Amino acid sequence: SSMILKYPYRVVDTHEKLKEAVTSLQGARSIALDIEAFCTTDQAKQLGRISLVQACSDAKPVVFLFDVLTLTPDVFVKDMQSLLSDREIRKLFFDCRRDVEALSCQLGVKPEGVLDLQVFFTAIQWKLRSVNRRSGMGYVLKSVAGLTRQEGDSAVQTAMTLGNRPVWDIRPLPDHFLEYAAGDVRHILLLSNYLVGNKDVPVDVVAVERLTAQYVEHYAVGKPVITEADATPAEVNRAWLERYIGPGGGCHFCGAKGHTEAECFKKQNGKAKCSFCGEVGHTARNCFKKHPQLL
Ligand SMILES: Nc1ncnc2c1ncn2[C@@H]1O[C@H](COP(=O)(O)O)[C@@H](O)[C@H]1O
Numbered sequence: 001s002s003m004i005l006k007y008p009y010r011v012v013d014t015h016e017k018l019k020e021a022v023t024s025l026q027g028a029r030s031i032a033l034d035i036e037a038f039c040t041t042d043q044a045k046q047l048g049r050i051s052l053v054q055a056c057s058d059a060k061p062v063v064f065l066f067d068v069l070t071l072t073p074d075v076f077v078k079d080m081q082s083l084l085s086d087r088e089i090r091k092l093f094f095d096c097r098r099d100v101e102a103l104s105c106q107l108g109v110k111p112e113g114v115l116d117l118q119v120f121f122t123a124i125q126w127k128l129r130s131v132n133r134r135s136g137m138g139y140v141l142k143s144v145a146g147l148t149r150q151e152g153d154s155a156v157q158t159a160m161t162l163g164n165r166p167v168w169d170i171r172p173l174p175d176h177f178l179e180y181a182a183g184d185v186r187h188i189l190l191l192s193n194y195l196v197g198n199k200d201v202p203v204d205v206v207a208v209e210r211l212t213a214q215y216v217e218h219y220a221v222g223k224p225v226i227t228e229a230d231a232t233p234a235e236v237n238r239a240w241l242e243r244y245i246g247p248g249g250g251c252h253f254c255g256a257k258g259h260t261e262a263e264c265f266k267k268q269n270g271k272a273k274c275s276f277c278g279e280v281g282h283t284a285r286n287c288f289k290k291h292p293q294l295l
Pocket residue numbers: 034035036037038039040047048157160161162163184
């Protein structure tokens with residue numbers, strides 16, 4: 001699965017290349033998606049103009065970078081909409097809210113069969129700790145796969161953070177912009193191997209598909225979305241978490257919300273440590289080394 005991180009990118013910027021990419025993605029079971037958009041100077045909620053859509057599936061070891069700007073939304077949608085609409089093909093996102101709004105407003109398509117892995121992580125946190133906070137991809141990759149995420153080129157990130165120019169409008173795109181764009185979908189598809197079809201994961205994939213579908217419905221309405229689904233940008237609607245995931249959990253050792261027993265201070269600090277030999281698990285009064293007359 002760390003093979004996914006070495007998938008090279010192909011730029012899909014012609015009608016011919018688009019048919020080929022579409023043919024390959026049609027054979028997939030899961031497709032990780034992302035959007036790179038023109039930076040908004042204003043810094044309002046919606047993504048700016050779609051520049052690239054990035055796709056990486058379990059059907060081929062490759063990241064497609066669809067140059068929507070060059071192809072035009074019209075040509076892109078003609079060939080991609082049935083695949084986007086096909087609920088039998090899982091679309092994997094990391095925070096789908098804005099991406100879905102953009103697909104709806106700018107391309108006229110609503111994706112079906114969507115799974116939001118940022119929402120998946122929060123659902124796990126809800127189930128175990130009563131935490132409805134959203135985590136960045138870095139934190140999630142670390143916590144779930146033990147991977148330190150290789151950041152993208154700092155020029156790209158800096159240009160974007162300044163917010164005074166579009167950034168993603170230049171053509172051709174330099175190589176380091178393309179490599180930046182390909183980053184997220186590889187991480188998304190990698191991450192889905194740890195979350196989907198894994199019995200160590202305490203939430204059902206279908207419950208998260210159902211929570212994801214609330215986000216798709218809220219954000220794919222053909223127009224800019226005014227009222228947000230979540231109380232603040234960095235969390236997940238608690239009422240939706242109760243509905244699709246169930247009641248929030250907490251620490252089985254001390255009863256408090258916010259942590260599990262493996263992270264409980266009181267559980268670790270409460271365990272017997274031998275004052276004589278140092279080993280956790282017995283007291284001194286039961287220590288074979290301190291008292292050999294117990295052998
Ligand atoms: N630091 C940033 N400052 C401004 N816009 C950003 C920034 N990061 C991302 N964006 C915008 O959001 C899009 C999605 O980025 P990402 O969520 O990494 O896939 C980018 O293509 C930009 O349009």
